[PDB]
Amino acid sequence: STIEEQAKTFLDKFNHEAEDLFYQSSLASWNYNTNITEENVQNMNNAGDKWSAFLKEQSTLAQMYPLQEIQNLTVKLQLQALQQNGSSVLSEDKSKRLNTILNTMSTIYSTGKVCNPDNPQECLLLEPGLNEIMANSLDYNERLWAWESWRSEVGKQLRPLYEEYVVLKNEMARANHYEDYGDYWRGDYEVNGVDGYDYSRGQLIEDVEHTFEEIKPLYEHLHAYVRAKLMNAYPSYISPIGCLPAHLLGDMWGRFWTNLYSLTVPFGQKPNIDVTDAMVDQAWDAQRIFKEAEKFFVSVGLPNMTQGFWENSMLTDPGNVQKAVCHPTAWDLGKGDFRILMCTKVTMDDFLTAHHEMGHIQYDMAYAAQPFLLRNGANEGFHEAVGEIMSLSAATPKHLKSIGLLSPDFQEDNETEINFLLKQALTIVGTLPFTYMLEKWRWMVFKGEIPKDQWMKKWWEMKREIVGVVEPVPHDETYCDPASLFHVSNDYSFIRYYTRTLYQFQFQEALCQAAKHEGPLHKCDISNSTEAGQKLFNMLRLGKSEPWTLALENVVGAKNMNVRPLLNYFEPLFTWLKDQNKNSFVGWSTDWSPYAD
Amino acid sequence: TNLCPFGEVFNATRFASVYAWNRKRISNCVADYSVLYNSASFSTFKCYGVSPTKLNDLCFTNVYADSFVIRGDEVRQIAPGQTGKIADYNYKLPDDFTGCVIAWNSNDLDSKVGGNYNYLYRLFRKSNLKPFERDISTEIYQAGSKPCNGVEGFNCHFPLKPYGFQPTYGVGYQPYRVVVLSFELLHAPATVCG
Ligand SMILES: *[C@@H]1O[C@H](CO)[C@@H](O[C@@H]2O[C@H](CO)[C@@H](O[C@@H]3O[C@H](CO[C@H]4O[C@H](CO)[C@@H](O)[C@H](O)[C@@H]4O[C@@H]4O[C@H](CO)[C@@H](O)[C@H](O)[C@H]4NC(C)=O)[C@@H](O)[C@H](O[C@H]4O[C@H](CO)[C@@H](O[C@@H]5O[C@H](CO)[C@@H](O[C@@H]6O[C@H](CO)[C@H](O)[C@H](O)[C@H]6O)[C@H](O)[C@H]5NC(C)=O)[C@H](O)[C@@H]4O[C@@H]4O[C@H](CO)[C@@H](O[C@@H]5O[C@H](CO)[C@H](O)[C@H](O)[C@H]5O)[C@H](O)[C@H]4NC(C)=O)[C@@H]3O)[C@H](O)[C@H]2NC(C)=O)[C@H](O)[C@H]1NC(C)=O
Ligand SMILES: *[C@@H]1O[C@H](CO)[C@@H](O[C@@H]2O[C@H](CO)[C@@H](O[C@@H]3O[C@H](CO[C@H]4O[C@H](CO)[C@@H](O[C@@H]5O[C@H](CO)[C@@H](O[C@@H]6O[C@H](CO)[C@H](O)[C@H](O)[C@H]6O)[C@H](O)[C@H]5NC(C)=O)[C@H](O)[C@@H]4O)[C@@H](O)[C@H](O[C@H]4O[C@H](CO)[C@@H](O[C@@H]5O[C@H](CO)[C@@H](O[C@@H]6O[C@H](CO)[C@H](O)[C@H](O)[C@H]6O)[C@H](O)[C@H]5NC(C)=O)[C@H](O)[C@@H]4O[C@@H]4O[C@H](CO)[C@@H](O)[C@H](O)[C@H]4NC(C)=O)[C@@H]3O)[C@H](O)[C@H]2NC(C)=O)[C@H](O)[C@H]1NC(C)=O
Ligand SMILES: *[C@@H]1O[C@H](CO)[C@@H](O[C@@H]2O[C@H](CO)[C@@H](O[C@@H]3O[C@H](CO[C@H]4O[C@H](CO)[C@@H](O)[C@H](O)[C@@H]4O)[C@@H](O)[C@H](O[C@H]4O[C@H](CO)[C@@H](O)[C@H](O)[C@@H]4O)[C@@H]3O)[C@H](O)[C@H]2NC(C)=O)[C@H](O)[C@H]1NC(C)=O
Ligand SMILES: *[C@@H]1O[C@H](CO)[C@@H](O[C@@H]2O[C@H](CO)[C@@H](O[C@@H]3O[C@H](CO)[C@@H](O)[C@H](O)[C@@H]3O)[C@H](O)[C@H]2NC(C)=O)[C@H](O)[C@H]1NC(C)=O
Ligand SMILES: *[C@@H]1O[C@H](CO)[C@@H](O[C@@H]2O[C@H](CO)[C@@H](O[C@@H]3O[C@H](CO)[C@@H](O)[C@H](O)[C@@H]3O)[C@H](O)[C@H]2NC(C)=O)[C@H](O)[C@H]1NC(C)=O
Ligand SMILES: *[C@@H]1O[C@H](CO)[C@@H](O[C@@H]2O[C@H](CO)[C@@H](O)[C@H](O)[C@H]2NC(C)=O)[C@H](O)[C@H]1NC(C)=O
Ligand SMILES: *[C@@H]1O[C@H](CO)[C@@H](O)[C@H](O)[C@H]1NC(C)=O
Ligand SMILES: [Cl-]
Ligand SMILES: [Zn+2]
């Protein structure tokens, strides 16, 4: 009778067809990812086409229910989720061109190789060729060749495609009543209707910028420390008061400084905690790893893995005759079907990955009770933070000792804690300015604050000011260095990595207080605390039904993003950094360029 | 003096769909209820309005076994005073019942690879069901004021949707075969005993 009542019954029919199709399609994807055959590729695609065609029809039907007429929020939000046409807001030929450009820059990224003209037959592709050089090469010139020739050959072909992509995405976002395509991306965090828990797309920028200024002291001390270590290694290439050359940061873009550990380790004589050998000595297999992860989640008052998870998952590389995608994934096909695809080896790294992916399955099971649409993490940052806090607790030597993998003969040397925390800082603290600056640039590019004749001029103004990294070769407007990174040329929001990084430390900080943990936050293991498991579950069972502000508040007692716990995790490293940088210049000067002497 | 054909009901090769649930009348026979209860096979065996131990020590004029297939989650709806798509639109037990609900997992018999679509359930109905009322009409659900005209569309929905029953489904989305024992006593000769 009322529009609200009719939309409730439409959603019923929708939840029952979507659950079905999504299952069949997911099963086709499982079959291809576990058994890579030409027949399986064909069946995977036909399912993808059906699912797309289904959602197209359903979007047109959802459109027919005026949102204004609904008072019920969980129904109004579910209807809204469906109503977004996305691409079809543009003309047939304009949408065809957008899909064309999107396809092309994806293809150029995944298939663009760089040849050494000396041998025209031999060329290096980014994966594995170029990526290997950027993560393993110590030769200054080799790294510079790989950094520059990737941007010059591939990063220059992407430049005119990106310009058209920006203008088309903006026109699409304008039609969806967003100001720019960046505002559209920020729409994920937006919450309206719920008084006290509302969140605006503009607030996100204020909150990322305020939290970032609090990271600036630790990051400055980290950057200065790294610059000192790098300066010793390449003496005649780095300035004690300048930026760090982009080609000397451990990876193709310096996204994360984890590979710099080799050259920045504080205590080189002290060994590392790698229970790999202990697992091999105790005859552990892929099954014992997943059974140990299950024990972890059951100890926190969480459900045991379903009987179907044990029979249907592929937790080992399938021998030698059938090929399989070996990326560790957590599948949730619907209808109670939960699987993990992981080509598991008896290593500590795989053992920790079992906890991360099994945490995703735990989140999946918790919100599986919700209606189909609302079966997702609270915001784009949420699901990845959940899996990560498990691998945090599992990696603690305290945990390892209790599970028998770490010998009780292991004495906690505070030098190993500094080696550990620096390796952590290199990944986590180091990626925050990179992630911030990249999105800041992207948001302003859509905003219309940076013209095309300034795109690269500003990209390197921002890399020097915000990140404290300098380009080793002068890049003009024929280059497109942002696009030479996966997410930029593959149309993916990057801010998720900033938000989720701050979330995971908030989550751990809250669950560790619930676990009545005493001492350094980096040594916390939340095992056997069913109170911490209840605290976490309260949010996990919510899914996307309630605002992320309220979801977060259900765990940490706060409606907003917070740096305080991340800084708290790294406070012992920070005092050490503050001591080691006593005789060094902390901070950078933007005028120094490696190429300009 | 022959035994009631309970195996004919419980061991049927194919069961009915819940919306068009099947009813069998058991008559002129000696019913052994301990054979049914003492088995451990069934995932559920609940008797209402009468104790199962005192069933052998009683005569009725007739017995009715109502059989059908539903998901694991919905098994809690085949009980008096319960609500949801099944209790509301498919099979309704009176709020005050006198009989037994016997249910067991039939993932081995009723869920094929690729999905078994032979089992349907009613998703929409314009009125709640009365106890033991059966509805088999495939009339289009007119959700809106707009006349449907026998065609599926906006505010026009096919009331019957299928259980895609697949062997890899979780227990709550898996097939469960349900048999409901009704006891009848009229001013007429008692055909069933113990
Ligand atoms: C907006 O919109 C929206 C949409 O529409 C809405 O919402 C909605 O609402 C509704 C209401 O009703 C709901 O419904 C509900 O639900 C629930 C849940 O379910 C679920 O889960 C399960 C598991 O757990 C399963 O099985 C199922 O199936 C389901 O699933 C899913 O879910 C989801 C979510 O929910 C969805 O979405 C989906 O869809 C689904 N699926 C499908 C396929 O469908 C339920 O539960 C309910 O039911 C009812 O009935 C029953 C009987 O049958 C009962 O039961 C009970 O329970 C409990 C628990 O809980 C128990 O206890 C326990 O148990 C255990 C075992 O189990 C043990 O034994 C222990 O010891 C114990 O303790 C008990 O016992 C039982 N009982 C018996 C005798 O058995 C329940 O409870 C219920 O009841 C009732 O109902 C009513 C209604 O009918 C109510 O009343 C009223 O109403 C009105 C209206 O009409 C108003 O509302 C008022 O206020 C009220 O009051 C009551 O309350 C109840 N109760 C209680 C306590 O609560 C149902 O069905 C839905 O669902 C929803 N949705 C969502 C999404 O959520 C909203 O609301 C809007 N908004 C606003 C603001 O409004
Ligand atoms: C990797 O990858 C690769 C590639 O892919 C693989 O290889 C291969 O694969 C394939 C697949 O792809 C396979 O198969 C083939 O194919 C065909 C087709 O089918 C399928 O597909 C399609 C699409 O294309 C679909 O569609 C459709 O659907 C529909 C529905 O919707 C249907 O309908 C139906 O029909 C029926 C009849 O037929 C009825 O009527 C019903 O009612 C309806 O509904 C249709 O039909 C379709 N279409 C078509 C055209 O067909 C579908 O669905 C599907 O999916 C097929 O057919 C064939 O098959 C054959 O063979 C087999 C052997 O192997 C046999 O048997 C089987 O066995 C197994 C064991 O081994 C079993 O299992 C089991 O079972 C149980 C029960 O019994 C349970 O379930 C468990 O769980 C499980 O495990 C099963 O079952 C069986 N089956 C059945 C069905 O049951 C079959 O049967 C067949 O044959 C037959 O046989 C018999 C005796 O036995 C005789 O009697 C008959 O006559 C015959 N028939 C014929 C037709 O022939 C084909 O073959 C293949 O097989 C494969 N290979 C091998 C060596 O195996 C691989 O495998 C992978 N790998 C891994 C490791 O993964
Ligand atoms: C959101 O983005 C999607 C992207 O695809 C767009 O989806 C398609 O939208 C077009 C219209 O712009 C749909 O085209 C046609 O829809 C018809 C349905 O309505 C008919 O009947 C009513 C009376 O009941 C008439 O008033 C009306 O004028 C129409 O005659 C169908 O006849 C067709 O859809 C059929 O698609 C396939 C075959 O191609 C069949 O399998 C289906 O059963 C179905 O009947 C026709 O194509 C089109 O259906 C939508 N796509 C899909 C795949 O369904 C959305 O339009 C866009 N949002 C908005 C608001 O336009
Ligand atoms: C619930 O999840 C837990 C996983 O934490 C599972 O329960 C465990 O089942 C194993 C079965 O082998 C039990 O193992 C036993 O270990 C002892 C030594 O500790 C050994 O002497 C025994 O012979 C046996 O191998 C284990 O104790 C048990 N743990 C608990 C606390 O229950 C199980 O998979 C899940 N159960 C259900 C009902 O789903
Ligand atoms: C979480 O709780 C479980 C269960 O209480 C803890 O498991 C216990 O772990 C200890 C070893 O860390 C086991 O102790 C052993 O006892 C035997 C005999 O008593 C002894 O011979 C061994 O030398 C050893 O001391 C204990 O059996 C085991 N209990 C169970 C039921 O598994 C677990 O350690 C806790 N983990 C954390 C991180 O809090
Ligand atoms: C047909 O019905 C009879 C009786 O209901 C079932 O008998 C069972 O037989 C197995 C051994 O095959 C025993 O373990 C059970 O205890 C028996 N149950 C009862 C209630 O007597 C028989 O299995 C059924 N047949 C099929 C194929 O389902
Ligand atoms: C940390 O490590 C150094 C190693 O030389 C040691 O002297 C010191 O006592 C340790 N503890 C603290 C809290 O500084
Ligand atoms: Cl770059
Ligand atoms: Zn993950």
Residue numbers in the entry:
A (entry chain A): 19 to 615
B (entry chain C): 333 to 526
Study text:
We previously generated two SARS-CoV-2 spike proteins that each contain six RBD changes that were detected during persistent infection of an immunocompromised individual infected with a SARS-CoV-2 strain containing the D614GS mutation. To determine the impact of their combined mutations on human ACE2 binding, we generated recombinant RBDs for the day 146* and day 152* spike protein mutants. (B) Day 146* RBD–ACE2 ectodomain x-ray crystal structure. The N501YRBD substitution is found in multiple VOCs; once it surfaced in the immunocompromised individual, it was retained at later time points. As also shown in a cryo–electron microscopy (cryo-EM) structure of the SARS-CoV-2 spike protein containing the N501YRBD substitution bound to ACE2 (33), the side chain of Y501RBD interacts with Y41ACE2 and K353ACE2 with no notable structural change. In structures of Wuhan-Hu-1 SARS-CoV-2 RBD bound to ACE2, E484RBD is near but does not directly contact the receptor. In the day 146* RBD–ACE2 complex structure, the K493RBD side chain reaches over the RBD surface to recruit the E484RBD side chain to form a new salt bridge with K31ACE2. The nearby Y489HRBD mutation, which removes a polar contact with ACE2, better accommodates repositioning of E484RBD because the histidine is smaller than the tyrosine side chain and would avoid potential steric clashes with E484RBD in this binding mode. A second rotamer for residue H34ACE2 forms additional RBD contacts to fill a gap created by the reorganization of local interactions. This structural plasticity may explain how the RBD tolerates an unexpectedly large number of mutations during intrahost evolution yet retains the ability to bind ACE2 tightly.
